């Protein structure tokens, strides 16, 4: 799903839903949050 393009980029949100079909569920599966962990969420 991430392949292709004149520059290497994803082009869509890399977080995919839990109920995505196999072959579609690549990236950050059913992610509740992204980004660097800070403060309470790092605890």
């Amino acid at each position: 799903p991430h392949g292709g393009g004149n520059h290497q980029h994803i082009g869509h949100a890399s977080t995919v839903r839990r109920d995505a079909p196999p072959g579609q569920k690549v990236g950050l599966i059913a992610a509740r949050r992204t980004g660097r962990l800070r403060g309470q969420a790092a605890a």
């Binding site: 799903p1 196999p22 072959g23 569920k25 690549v26």
Partner: protein, 52 residues
């Protein structure tokens, strides 16, 4: 499209575990009357490296 790499692992073919040099499963001993109601004495004989 074609079947992606994540999908190819469930078929096993080249993605099976590499276990030719492994030493067997690691676990307790099947629980019996001896271990329920007292104690069984064992002696450690070797400490061995398990590949993987």
């Amino acid at each position: 499209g074609r079947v992606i790499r994540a999908q190819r692992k469930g078929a096993g073919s080249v993605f099976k575990s590499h276990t030719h040099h492994r030493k067997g499963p690691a676990r307790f001993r099947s629980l019996d009357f001896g271990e329920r109601n007292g104690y069984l004495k064992g002696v450690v004989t070797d400490v061995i490296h398990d590949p993987g």
